[PDB]
């Protein structure tokens, strides 16, 4: 018969990266995260009222481009099921990140947290490196996932980590 390969994708041994889902940007529009294929990614939930939101986005933003020249990403997803994190517009979180310099997308739409999780980030909790002990579920906000060139969580820093705890690893990729 005609076709030569076909899959119904069952469960998570069919998903192997960000490249088997896509997230909404801040304006509404689909990401496709399949063009992370090739490109040294970086994966993690932002918010403007966190105690360390500028420790974060002062270091995000250099290392965007410091390695822009080699292929570095970084998906920021705003979210508030942690508490207190994100409660304004998302017209506000747009251009929030702009306050910062940041020339990468922000992103929108997404849950971390509860039965109705995004798939994106369940694929990556159900991981080696995102899996707890016990009852797993991110600690709290600006929780960072390593991705290697190849779309594969390599490893996962806690939310107190500064993007400079990635800048030791990311050199190794590429």
């Not at 517009?89 to 020339?103: D, L, M, R, T």
Request: charged share 25%.
């Amino acid at each position: 018969g005609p076709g030569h390969m076909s899959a119904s994708r069952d469960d998570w041994r069919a998903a192997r990266s960000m490249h088997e889902f896509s997230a909404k940007d801040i304006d509404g529009h689909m990401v496709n995260l399949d063009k992370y294929r090739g490109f040294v990614s970086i994966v993690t939930n932002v918010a403007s009222q966190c105690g360390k939101t500028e420790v974060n986005y002062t270091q995000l933003v250099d290392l965007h481009a410091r390695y822009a020249e080699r292929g570095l990403r970084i998906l920021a997803f705003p979210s508030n099921q942690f508490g207190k994190q994100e409660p304004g517009s998302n017209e506000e979180i747009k251009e929030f990140a702009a306050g910062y310099n940041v020339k990468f997308d922000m992103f929108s739409k997404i849950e971390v947290n509860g039965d109705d999780a995004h798939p994106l980030w369940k694929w990556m909790k159900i991981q080696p490196k995102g899996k707890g002990i016990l009852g797993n579920a991110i600690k709290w906000n600006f929780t960072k996932f390593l991705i290697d060139k190849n779309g594969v969580v390599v490893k996962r820093y806690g939310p107190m980590e500064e993007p400079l705890v990635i800048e030791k690893d990311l050199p190794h990729y590429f």
